[PDB]
RNA sequence: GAAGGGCCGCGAGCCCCCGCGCCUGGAGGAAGGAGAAGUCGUAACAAGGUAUCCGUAGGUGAACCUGCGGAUGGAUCCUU
RNA sequence: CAUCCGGUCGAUCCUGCCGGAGCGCGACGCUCUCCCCAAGGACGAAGCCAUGCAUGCCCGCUCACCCGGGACGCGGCGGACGGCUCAGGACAACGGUUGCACCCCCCGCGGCGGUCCCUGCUAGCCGGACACCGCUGGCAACCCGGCGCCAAGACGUGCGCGCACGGGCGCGCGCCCCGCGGGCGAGCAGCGUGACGCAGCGACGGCCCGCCCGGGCUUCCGGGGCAUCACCCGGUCGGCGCGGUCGCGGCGCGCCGAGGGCCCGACGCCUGGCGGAGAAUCAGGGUUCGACUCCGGAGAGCGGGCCUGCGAGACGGCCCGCACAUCCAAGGACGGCAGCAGGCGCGGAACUUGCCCAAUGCGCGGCGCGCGAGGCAGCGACGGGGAGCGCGCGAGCGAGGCGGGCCCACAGCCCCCGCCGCGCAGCCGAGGGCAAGGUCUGUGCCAGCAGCCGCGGUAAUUCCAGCUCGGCGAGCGUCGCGCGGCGCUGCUGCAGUUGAAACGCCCGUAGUUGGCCCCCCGCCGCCACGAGGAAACGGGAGCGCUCCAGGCAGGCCCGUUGGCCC
């Protein structure tokens, strides 16, 4: 269409975002950045529509321009900033610290953390590139790191210190790793890998066993290592056990009675 | 009939060729009717009445059904349309705008009016029914 | 316009044959008994019952305890039980079949006020609701076909500002 | 308006295709810059704004002798054997794969050297060492090539043979 | 053609209204490198490649020769 | 390095010539269908007063008539 | 969400249509007591357009007016998105599925940052100069001429790590292959070493690499009719070398072959052809429509060509031919509503030449402007929803009216108040289908009615009135269309002795179809379940918008929701 599409329609927006059909013909277009539009939530949704700090966009802009927002140690002044998996969302004036993890409904739920919990962002190695004569690695948030420990292979786990912009810890992707799923039918689910099938050609399919017993199979890329034999991050209360439809009705029915 | 797991093409071809055999499908989907219809796909059309004429009733009924010879403006095709209701031909005058709509038989003729495919509905921009009831 | 986005739907189904007299007579009885202004109100409840019974027909074919059977059976029986269209004793997918236009009409609130003696006649009851003199949980309702629920049956009562020591002046008394 | 679209072409069955869109700028082609050889490198702005160098007239290039590992700039004396059009040989146009006579003077010292073959050392005396251009001057803006070595030479000597 | 073959693909397409399939055919142009030897009527494997001609986007990987002399879905 | 000038490239438009699809004006000819009924016979239906009918050929105001080979849907399930 | 009924006869049983009966979506008639929602110049005119308006923002630089605000200018960023329409286009678009070891990309985000000599350089730091402007101007207009003053994060230069460094150019694995990587299913990358070239960018240093998003092509499958179109093509089909491109490829050009496509329908022709998600109708299997709401395509009167660009073959850019215009002072200039309003033409048909950025997003700016995107009203019986025209013998309303709140960008609307208080039905019908007069007049095969069968020729169940009565109801009738009816298109599931229809016969190629037969696998088709795939919609969980059509709300709350299915 002669160039990039700046606007984005409300109907043509991801379902993990949860826009309302009405209220606008437009939904926020996430400006290019650490996370991709399909797999990121703009900050305006997490600020005026989920923590409900601001009423409108204009309000959100003022409290974003003021350096109060803190994503990954950076001031961040734009409302449609992309936020993504394992991105620390710290709000300091309100003194609440959270990390944006996925949820068992498949949407992204802000997971409350401590000051000690904040300061580290877990990352996934996508590719190792030898450009400019130095080895670099690829993370989902577009972070690029020169001279990796040669032991790190692929689809591995990184933990940026976020203070020196260097990896702190590395988990090797193999059978036996607590993992959360960042895409697909199986999403926001923490369980541990049972098999990684190569399928020479394309699309490696890994099968993973949840704690309770649910076995679910998804693509390799959809996986995101969360730890080794321990979660290594705060697990959202449900620890991605994943409810049956009837149990979900009963959770809603019990909740309604209490209110 | 053709009965093979691999005979879908023949069965599709037979339906395509045989479907046109029913007269109503041919009227609806050939496209010859759309060119021919004095009202081309329209519910109705406006025209000027050149002559007020009466068409003798087909047997066994005996009557001078009152009709108008109207030249439809959209196609410049002259046509015959019945003026409905009792003594309502009086409202029609030659050289007067009229709106002509179908007789409900989809281009066919109804009852004893021979070769009349339409009825006037509005004369001089006023509905014929309203004039007969003296509403206007 | 996001106005285009708003969904609208017909809520009633008309009869396949318009002049079946046995039915036309049976309908007249329902209208006179339930004070229904038009046959459309009789058809709207027929449509509501049809869907409700079509769903329980589909559900009954599904094998017992078929996960979706358990999930959708509850939301049918339990929402009907709240509405009160079904008496709570039955509580099984077999007896949703056997409901009638009268069962829906029974909870209309025109009937509920006549049933508890608040309104002498359905014709009087419709007149009462349109003058804002009936309340459910102290809600001044202007709707004759409110479709009141089992729990909200007890709350149905005369309005605070209409007859029991209220202003009691605007209207005939004020003159 | 030169274009590299497939819309203008016929189908594999020879059926005329119908034109759905008007010419696009992304599907564009440019007038060939036949590189004349003197006996200027133009800059053009491509897609992405990348600038490709187009040599229009280029005097000399970095030719090379791989077996003897000696590579020096040399002057392009004359062009022989285009292999696509005889017209290009007599207009001295410079394309990749174009046999050319480079001046033997930069490589003159190796004449004293020996054991780097014998046929190639005979060419050193004449002023005519055969060399195929290896770089598309229209796209890369340079005419760097390689001296013909071994059987390729014998084929290109037989082609150039006085008959 | 010169170092190129046309591979006939035979497959069944299922028309939904008639609960029946249709035998259907598509012809794929492939590059037959001089290494393998191909005579007409022989099964070959063709792999996708950068377009190498207007019609050739596939290159023969293997030839399974058949006997000296139907519709076969491969 | 401007105006310009040349050779090619891309290519509008026009000008012929050609093909294609459509849409139309026709003196005059020839149908068909509808009106209520006129004129001339009576061809078919009762063996309809020459059983009809089919193919084909010819001839007549008109239905039609006639030859030649069929058919029975005929008026014959039947007679060394 | 498995239904029929009226009509050939003197009757009958059929075939078979005709007609009804249902549901949409638009036009027309007549009529609309109030509120809530909501479609709205698409329909062989992608015809033409008066006028108004739809893209600005910014301060890098600031010696007219006003103060810290700068106007104008130059500079930057955007104007390629959005809004609009469906003309073109039928192995095309478009859908699902692959690839790019054949690729381009602004922003943002994360890395990374060494910049050759040598002459002349200033690196506490370079020029000269343009616009605005001062002067002096022509021109009907449009348009702009000179001469001087003078700034930038503008312009051009430019010192700077000979592990200096862009592009491209050489030589750098194999011993039958495959069994490690910086890596890969893949010999790909990177580097070393030759030589070329001096690419960056440096006057508020940043190239470059990545990721993202958005492309460009691409693989497989699906992707209209017409045989009164049967053969077709001739860069057409392959090879090879060059060129061109962002790259790939007959993409272009030589050269060299002779292919390539087709009754499994090629090619030709035609379309009142944008496709999909979907919409209508609706046991099932289906039929029909795919203007428009989201997604992808295409286009800006009709063709071409370009420039600027990171991206446009851009038209609220330019240039040219064409077609139709406009103003003229007669020499010139200048259009482009398939943006939102509005007119004209056309048609059966389709709204205001409002108000506004307050929301929602986007552009620019970090402390706010701009937007006919939108929002808000106005018009609006496309439609959808919910209430009225009384109840009861006594009370009352709501429709109003008028003030106040509240609401709203501002009104208003709803709603809440006090205060008075004005209820009101149409449109089709009563012989049958098909519910409801064997009433009384007029009229006498007239007038008219009647989808259909039939009524009317003097005791008219059918016309014209009155009278009653039915049906639906603020709507009802009519006309056109699609579906159902319809098993009258038949895969399920039609019929062919006589109702319509077995070719006069026989051979026969494609096509279609093939006896029985091996338990054990290889490839099929097949079937089961996987992943992975936009929402809207549809189905569906919860939730009293007063009910409701709705909407995702809400309540001190599963990580309160907003599940799940397609």
Author numbering:
A (entry chain SE): 2 to 134, 136 to 261
B (entry chain SO): 3 to 138
C (entry chain SK): 2 to 176
D (entry chain SI): 2 to 40, 51 to 174
E (entry chain SM): 78 to 146, 150 to 154
In the authors' words:
The highly compact and uniquely GC-rich Giardia ribosomes possess eukaryotic rRNAs and ribosomal proteins, but retain some bacterial features. The translocation intermediates, with naturally bound tRNAs and eukaryotic elongation factor 2 (eEF2), display characteristic ribosomal intersubunit rotation and small subunit’s head swiveling—universal for translocation.
Structure B is a hitherto unknown eEF2-bound chimeric hybrid-like intermediate, where eEF2 is in the GDP state with a distinct density for the leaving Pi held by the catalytic H143 from Sw-II. The SSU body in B is slightly rotated: 1.05° compared to state C, but corresponding to a back-rotation of 8.9° from the D states. However, the SSU head is still highly swiveled: 17.5° compared to state C, and 13.3° on an orthogonal rotation axis compared to the D states. eEF2 domain IV is inserted between the SSU A and P sites (∼10 Å from the P site). We observe clear density for the P*/E tRNA. However, there is no density corresponding to the A/P tRNA similar to previous studies, which indicates lower stability of the A/P tRNA during the dynamic state of translocation by eEF2. We found a clear density of GDP in the G domain of eEF2, which is coordinated by interactions from P-loop (G1), G4 and G5 motifs, similar to other reported EF-G/eEF2 structures. A distinct density of the ‘leaving Pi’ group can be seen in the path of the expected trajectory for Pi release held by the interaction with H143. This indicates that we have trapped a mimic of the post-GTP hydrolysis eEF2 intermediate on the ribosome closer to the completion of Pi release. In our structure, domain IV of eEF2 is extensively stabilized through interactions with the SSU head and H69 of 25S rRNA, in the absence of A/P tRNA. We conclude that post-GTP hydrolysis, SSU body back-rotation pulls down domain III of EF-2 via uS12, which in turn pulls back Sw-II with the catalytic His, thereby guiding the Pi release.
